[PDB]
Amino acid sequence: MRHRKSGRQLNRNSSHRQAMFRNMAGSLVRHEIIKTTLPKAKELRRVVEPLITLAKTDSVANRRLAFARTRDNEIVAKLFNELGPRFASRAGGYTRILKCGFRAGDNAPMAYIELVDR
Amino acid sequence: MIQEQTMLNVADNSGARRVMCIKVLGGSHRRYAGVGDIIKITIKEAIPRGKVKKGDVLKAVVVRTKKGVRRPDGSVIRFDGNACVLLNNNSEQPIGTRIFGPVTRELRSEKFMKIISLAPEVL
Amino acid sequence: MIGLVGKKVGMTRIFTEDGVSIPVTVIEVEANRVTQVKDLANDGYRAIQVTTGAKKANRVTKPEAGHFAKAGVEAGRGLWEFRLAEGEEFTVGQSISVELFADVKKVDVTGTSKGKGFAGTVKRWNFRTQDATHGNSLSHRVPGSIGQNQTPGKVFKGKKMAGQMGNERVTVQSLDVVRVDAERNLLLVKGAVPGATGSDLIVKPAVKA
Amino acid sequence: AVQQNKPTRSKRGMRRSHDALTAVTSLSVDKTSGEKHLRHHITADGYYRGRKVIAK
Amino acid sequence: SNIIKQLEQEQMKQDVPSFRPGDTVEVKVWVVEGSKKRLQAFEGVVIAIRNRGLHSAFTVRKISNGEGVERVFQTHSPVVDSISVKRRGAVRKAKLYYLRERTGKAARIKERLN
Amino acid sequence: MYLIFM
RNA sequence: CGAUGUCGGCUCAUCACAUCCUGGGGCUGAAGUAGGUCCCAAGGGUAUGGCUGUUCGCCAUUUAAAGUGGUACGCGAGCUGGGUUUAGAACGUCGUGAGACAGUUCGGUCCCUAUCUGCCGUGGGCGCUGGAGAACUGAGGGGGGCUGCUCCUAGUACGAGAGGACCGGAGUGGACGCAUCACUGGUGUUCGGGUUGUCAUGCCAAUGGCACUGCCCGGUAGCUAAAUGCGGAAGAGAUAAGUGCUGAAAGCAUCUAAGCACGAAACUUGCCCCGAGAUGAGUUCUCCCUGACCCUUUAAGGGUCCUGAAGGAACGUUGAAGACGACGACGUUGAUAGGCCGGGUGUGUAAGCGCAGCGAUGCGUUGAGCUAACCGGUACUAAUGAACCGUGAGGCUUAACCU
RNA sequence: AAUUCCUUGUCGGGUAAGUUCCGACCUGCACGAAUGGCGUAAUGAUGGCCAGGCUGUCUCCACCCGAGACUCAGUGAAAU
RNA sequence: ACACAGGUGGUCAGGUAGAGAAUACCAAGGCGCUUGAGAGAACUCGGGUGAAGGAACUAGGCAAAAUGGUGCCGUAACUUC
RNA sequence: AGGACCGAACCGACUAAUGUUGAAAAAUUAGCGGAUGACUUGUGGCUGGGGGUGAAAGGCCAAUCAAACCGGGAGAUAGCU
Numbered sequence A: 001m002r003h004r005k006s007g008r009q010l011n012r013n014s015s016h017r018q019a020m021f022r023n024m025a026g027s028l029v030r031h032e033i034i035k036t037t038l039p040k041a042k043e044l045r046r047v048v049e050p051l052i053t054l055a056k057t058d059s060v061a062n063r064r065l066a067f068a069r070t071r072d073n074e075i076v077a078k079l080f081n082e083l084g085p086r087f088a089s090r091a092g093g094y095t096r097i098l099k100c101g102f103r104a105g106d107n108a109p110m111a112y113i114e115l116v117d118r
Numbered sequence B: 001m002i003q004e005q006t007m008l009n010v011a012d013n014s015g016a017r018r019v020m021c022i023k024v025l026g027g028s029h030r031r032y033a034g035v036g037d038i039i040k041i042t043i044k045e046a047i048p049r050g051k052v053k054k055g056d057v058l059k060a061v062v063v064r065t066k067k068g069v070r071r072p073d074g075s076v077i078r079f080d081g082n083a084c085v086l087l088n089n090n091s092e093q094p095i096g097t098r099i100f101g102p103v104t105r106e107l108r109s110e111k112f113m114k115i116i117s118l119a120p121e122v123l
Numbered sequence C: 001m002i003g004l005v006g007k008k009v010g011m012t013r014i015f016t017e018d019g020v021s022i023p024v025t026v027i028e029v030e031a032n033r034v035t036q037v038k039d040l041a042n043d044g045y046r047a048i049q050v051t052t053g054a055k056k057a058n059r060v061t062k063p064e065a066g067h068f069a070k071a072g073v074e075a076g077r078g079l080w081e082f083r084l085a086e087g088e089e090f091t092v093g094q095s096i097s098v099e100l101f102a103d104v105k106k107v108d109v110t111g112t113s114k115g116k117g118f119a120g121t122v123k124r125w126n127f128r129t130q131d132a133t134h135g136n137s138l139s140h141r142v143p144g145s146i147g148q149n150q151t152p153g154k155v156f157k158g159k160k161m162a163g164q165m166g167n168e169r170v171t172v173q174s175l176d177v178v179r180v181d182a183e184r185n186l187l188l189v190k191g192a193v194p195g196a197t198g199s200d201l202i203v204k205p206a207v208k209a
Numbered sequence D: 001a002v003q004q005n006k007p008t009r010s011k012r013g014m015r016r017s018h019d020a021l022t023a024v025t026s027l028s029v030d031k032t033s034g035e036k037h038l039r040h041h042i043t044a045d046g047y048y049r050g051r052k053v054i055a056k
Numbered sequence E: 001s002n003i004i005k006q007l008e009q010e011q012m013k014q015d016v017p018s019f020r021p022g023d024t025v026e027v028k029v030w031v032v033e034g035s036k037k038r039l040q041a042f043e044g045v046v047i048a049i050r051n052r053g054l055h056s057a058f059t060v061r062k063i064s065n066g067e068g069v070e071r072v073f074q075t076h077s078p079v080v081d082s083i084s085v086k087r088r089g090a091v092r093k094a095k096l097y098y099l100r101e102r103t104g105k106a107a108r109i110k111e112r113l114n
Numbered sequence F: 001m002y003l004i005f006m
Numbered sequence G: 001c002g003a004u005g006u007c008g009g010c011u012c013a014u015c016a017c018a019u020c021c022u023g024g025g026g027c028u029g030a031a032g033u034a035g036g037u038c039c040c041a042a043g044g045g046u047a048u049g050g051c052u053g054u055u056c057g058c059c060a061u062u063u064a065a066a067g068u069g070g071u072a073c074g075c076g077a078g079c080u081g082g083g084u085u086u087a088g089a090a091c092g093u094c095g096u097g098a099g100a101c102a103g104u105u106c107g108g109u110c111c112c113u114a115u116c117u118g119c120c121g122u123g124g125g126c127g128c129u130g131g132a133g134a135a136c137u138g139a140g141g142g143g144g145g146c147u148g149c150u151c152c153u154a155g156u157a158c159g160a161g162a163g164g165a166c167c168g169g170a171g172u173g174g175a176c177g178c179a180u181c182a183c184u185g186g187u188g189u190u191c192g193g194g195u196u197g198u199c200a201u202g203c204c205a206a207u208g209g210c211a212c213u214g215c216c217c218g219g220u221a222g223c224u225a226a227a228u229g230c231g232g233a234a235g236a237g238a239u240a241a242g243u244g245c246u247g248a249a250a251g252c253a254u255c256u257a258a259g260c261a262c263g264a265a266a267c268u269u270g271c272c273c274c275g276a277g278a279u280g281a282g283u284u285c286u287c288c289c290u291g292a293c294c295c296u297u298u299a300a301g302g303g304u305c306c307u308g309a310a311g312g313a314a315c316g317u318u319g320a321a322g323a324c325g326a327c328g329a330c331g332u333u334g335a336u337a338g339g340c341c342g343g344g345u346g347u348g349u350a351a352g353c354g355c356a357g358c359g360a361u362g363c364g365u366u367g368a369g370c371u372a373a374c375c376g377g378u379a380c381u382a383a384u385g386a387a388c389c390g391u392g393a394g395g396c397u398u399a400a401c402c403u
Numbered sequence H: 001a002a003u004u005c006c007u008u009g010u011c012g013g014g015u016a017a018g019u020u021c022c023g024a025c026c027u028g029c030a031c032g033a034a035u036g037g038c039g040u041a042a043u044g045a046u047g048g049c050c051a052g053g054c055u056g057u058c059u060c061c062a063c064c065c066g067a068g069a070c071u072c073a074g075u076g077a078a079a080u
Numbered sequence I: 001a002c003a004c005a006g007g008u009g010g011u012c013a014g015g016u017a018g019a020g021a022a023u024a025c026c027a028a029g030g031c032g033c034u035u036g037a038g039a040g041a042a043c044u045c046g047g048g049u050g051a052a053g054g055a056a057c058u059a060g061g062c063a064a065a066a067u068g069g070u071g072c073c074g075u076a077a078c079u080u081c
Numbered sequence J: 001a002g003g004a005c006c007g008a009a010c011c012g013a014c015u016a017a018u019g020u021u022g023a024a025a026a027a028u029u030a031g032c033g034g035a036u037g038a039c040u041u042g043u044g045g046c047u048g049g050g051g052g053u054g055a056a057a058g059g060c061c062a063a064u065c066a067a068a069c070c071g072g073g074a075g076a077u078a079g080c081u
């Protein structure tokens, strides 16, 4: 039974999932569009969208909180100086998932995920 | 939740210091004994000049449980250790003359009217 | 007596002034509009058919919307039937309120259980597990033996085995009606009724003495 | 455990009566490119629902 | 849960005082000794508070007659007549379950003053 | 050990 | 004998009645209470430990009772491997000896991915005669059926006393079963905090990785029992053993031959669940389709053009539903999921700055900061315009009506 | 008794209850003196019994984290 | 027999903590083990936690749980000292 | 000083689980014994089948041991299938 539960396990342990979505969040902020599988792009929205709601208010305490969840300063400097100002008048829904074909090597359903203004 | 092989402290002045439950009386395949339930015990430790000797087989009544009792408004009253009062095998009247520590209102009936009379505190 | 159709809202507690905890289940019994009345000369048996709630007008199909427009009632979310007793009569379109249970002391509530999926024999049939230690080889929660030898040489029908548990209609009988709240369409029964929050319940008065 | 008699070509083909693939019902057509694609998927030229979304 | 929350809030007490874990409190409950009624106190230390609305509870622990006794009260029950804080305590936690292995001079809680 | 019926 | 694994334990059972308890009766050397014995009855129920490899037995303490048997002395392609039975070694005994014991003693590898039947679940296909969406009926089948103690009647009936009821009624438990999460709790490696060693982000401060989640302390939702609601019935029909009424054959007698009435947890129902593949394929309600032409083998015939309805499927967002199918909700005329806003819950007074202190650290801002699965809202993102399947009024005979 | 069949010999201790354990008696089926007799401190992955602590061994299981089992794409056996 | 969780002699010997060539985390250096993507049923393997009880389990405390360091105090019968 | 003590390398193989068409024709994981000695190890050499060698188990002598393996007598013999 998994009644009323959230989060996908994605065939990893607890610390591999946290390290994968942290690298993958730094790849979507940096490039503004990446191509992943469809179950990973759906679980990415729960990671990368709270980072942009964090980055709408500028303070030193919030920058130290978005550094503890990204571990990169090239990403924190872009969230607060670029993505904060853009999404400052939008109430959620900063990403967009576009389904595409299947992967050649294992027939996985792939999908693009992009920040909503490009 | 007292069951068989459970070692209980003793809450009267009969002389016994630790007794072990050897039977839960009052039903077939019966498992547990809450507060106010007769058990059949054996004496494991005793002071030298008490009324009972180590090795005797007696009856008892459970007066405190670590599992605790529940009140009709949902409240719970727990204790830090299981305790009991030694009864006579046949008359089922308490052997001792004093009760130590608090007891509960689950003993308030005609069967155990002499235990909540000697009790220092009833919760 | 006929019953009503409701919805399990969830559990709460009712405090009485003598200090008692009563676990009640809240059932939102909206008005039950009668859709069709069955009789002996046309249907072989006497019953009424009620609907409750409301449905989206773009979701009702053409066969269903014609069945409601014959009665004049508005389209609810389902259709249930109730067998009439000797002396009860209802009319098409009449709405039945929760005041049917005003002086009823006990009710039977039937619903669809929670789904536990494919459950093994320890969860489903309360079997005993075997030893977790002492030499056991890959056989801790398995059923064990399922028959006898050459006689009969088969497993009997109705053998207790692992399979789908829950998600089935069960009836819980003789629940105390604690409080009927007619002005906001509530019914507080005493105890646990089957089903998850938001599921349909059928509340009939108690048939046992 | 293992069989006691060889299963036929009849029983083998009956088992494969549910192994049959089904085809995609129909393909959607984009409204500015006219390309066929899967429904709710982007086309091979990066168009989706009248808009070019993947400029690659 | 607009139905249920409206059912519970017409049963909640409007006069519950503010207390924290560590506070020494005195709870007065209604006792029925057959027919006659009474009020006995329960002076002890609040070691756990459960905040859930109508289903709010709190746990008191006192050493009575040499035997430690815990009691879990329902906050909005009409058995509990009055709650009264006797002393404010200073702890760094929300559940003082470590006070079950301590006794005597080790179970002393500092006073808060703020 | 009771290895073969005997 | 080109192999049908042995005793015992565990797990799961199923049947018989020669009945252990509960149920109904006759006789009693049956006053009452408690018994003895026999007849009917298989619905349900029918112990925990000490010793021993033990089944068995003895013992301790319960219980209403701790039934007797069959099922390859039920059950190793379900588990164990303790035992009287491989190879090592020793004692006692027998043998000159190799060795042997019917005696004891310490140690000693238990394989198999299920084709068929069977059973537990769950779907696809076709049928049910135009197609479709619902709601039913109920042939049939399954589940359930246990019982203690206290009080009243009543210290009455009975009895010299001691003692002590039948019938009827109320309350409260044990075991079992079904549901559930409001409460008490468990879990909660997806929430918060404390702390050890070390590496890193240039450094301080603040953080992150790793060491079983590093080790711990709490804890939301969900799941759950030890938690808390409910159940077993009453009633009816036909009976068993039994008890009779009227009554002859047999002027009487006689429960029986004609006739009539009682009679049990067994049977048929009543309670709950599945159920029209019930091919005997049922019933009711609603909805949809009202064009043209040609030919042969002229018949429930085949083809062309137009047409595509009700509804379904498919795809997407998903669910207290789920192995996959299936089932439920929703798809812009939209709260289906994610996000966001507000709250709640949990943790326990963040970071930065200021002050006190030689310093660890304390204090103020501050019940602060963070907060998963929760509650109430909000179209910001994703749920597309289509396309696909499904047709065009539905055979013959006979009857009754309208014509 | 690593030896005793009768035998769970009988008495005492331990336990609520002990066919095993310890101490004895001698009726040694069928001990016995270098195929050594009786003791013996230390030692033993040695045999038997008891107690304290500890615990999912168990009453009686519940929840969680991972690797399979299930679904999809690729390759693709075996006993019989 | 395999691109096989096995076997195979010698030499070198960094930092922090540590008695240490143990162990944890790192440097130089080398790798992520030649099928993947989902789902989050029974059951099996490997682990974490558990209310009350605490060997009642069993042939048997099998297996798990627990103990665990340095300094100082203190330590019985028996003894071949 | 010690066939002394605790304990890594090294040597072993007491218990349990897994594996049993295995990753492996004897291993893996978690614990376990010895660990300056009757220790352990590399390279070469010697002992040959009714023979060797054996701190003795009928152990070992190339996955074979109450008499190795290869070739021959040889198409031994088979009242048995």
Ligand SMILES: CC[C@H]1OC(=O)[C@H](C)[C@@H](O[C@H]2C[C@@](C)(OC)[C@@H](O)[C@H](C)O2)[C@H](C)[C@@H](O[C@@H]2O[C@H](C)C[C@H](N(C)C)[C@H]2O)[C@](C)(O)C[C@@H](C)C(=O)[C@H](C)[C@@H](O)[C@]1(C)O
Pocket: F002, F003, F004, G003, G005, G110, G111, J020
């Ligand atoms: C790893 C897998 C091996 O299996 C085992 O180890 C199991 C556990 C044996 O039991 C073990 C353990 C045990 C107690 O038997 C269970 C013992 O009796 C036997 C000798 O060895 C089996 C089953 C034996 O059968 C039994 O042999 C008996 C002589 C007669 C019996 N009879 C009923 C047909 C029969 O089933 C026997 C001989 O090994 C089967 C033959 C074919 C083999 O030699 C095969 C090749 C085995 O090596 C094996 C299959 O590879």
Ligand SMILES: [Mg+2]
Pocket: A011
């Ligand atoms: Mg995988």
Ligand SMILES: [Mg+2]
Pocket: C137
């Ligand atoms: Mg095995």
Ligand SMILES: [Mg+2]
Pocket: C136, C137, C138, C139, C140
């Ligand atoms: Mg196992």
Ligand SMILES: [Mg+2]
Pocket: none
């Ligand atoms: Mg047959």
Ligand SMILES: [Mg+2]
Pocket: none
């Ligand atoms: Mg054969």
Ligand SMILES: [Mg+2]
Pocket: none
């Ligand atoms: Mg047998």
Ligand SMILES: [Mg+2]
Pocket: none
């Ligand atoms: Mg078998």
Ligand SMILES: [Mg+2]
Pocket: none
């Ligand atoms: Mg031998």
Ligand SMILES: [Mg+2]
Pocket: none
């Ligand atoms: Mg023999």
Ligand SMILES: [Mg+2]
Pocket: C137
């Ligand atoms: Mg096996």
Ligand SMILES: [Mg+2]
Pocket: none
């Ligand atoms: Mg029936």
Ligand SMILES: [Mg+2]
Pocket: none
């Ligand atoms: Mg809790």
Ligand SMILES: [Mg+2]
Pocket: none
């Ligand atoms: Mg935790």
Ligand SMILES: [Mg+2]
Pocket: none
């Ligand atoms: Mg620092």
Ligand SMILES: [Mg+2]
Pocket: G209
């Ligand atoms: Mg690192």
